[PDB]
């Protein structure tokens, strides 16, 4: 343990990013399965999640209207893991 090999650091960092993905995947799966008899849908949620998506270049019933929130939260997370995954190979150079 005087020195750590380079494959072990890269494997331990991609294990940390996969357990961050399972915590945000459980949160996306709870937000998808809501319903108007059990949940509230505040205006802040409407005007920040049906207005954000042209910063994503993403373009366009309450039980559809929860399901379009859960499409747009994890598709925000697809950009901010690909910007780390290209950064993790230029941490090698």
């Amino acid at each position: 343990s005087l020195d750590v090999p380079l494959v072990g650091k890269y494997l331990m960092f991609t294990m940390v990013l996969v357990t961050f993905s399972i915590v945000t995947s459980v949160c996306v799966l709870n937000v998808h399965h809501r319903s108007p008899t059990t949940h509230t849908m505040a205006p802040w949620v409407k005007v920040v999640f049906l207005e954000k998506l042209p910063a994503l270049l993403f373009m366009q019933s309450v039980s559809e209207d929860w399901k379009y929130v859960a499409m747009v939260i994890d598709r925000l997370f697809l950009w901010i893991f690909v910007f780390v995954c290209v950064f993790g190979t230029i941490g090698m150079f």
Binding site: P36, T37, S61, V62, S63
Partner: protein
Amino acid sequence: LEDKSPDSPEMKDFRHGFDILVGQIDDALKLANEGKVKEAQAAAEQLKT
């Protein structure tokens, strides 16, 4: 039942039951106009059913 519309037969079978509950009071007040107590208690056990 919220986003199912109020003219749907989900809402109508709810509204089909709620004319009976006036009429079981109108079965109860029918015998009550004599004031016979046990026939006013004949429909008093009916309304829980």
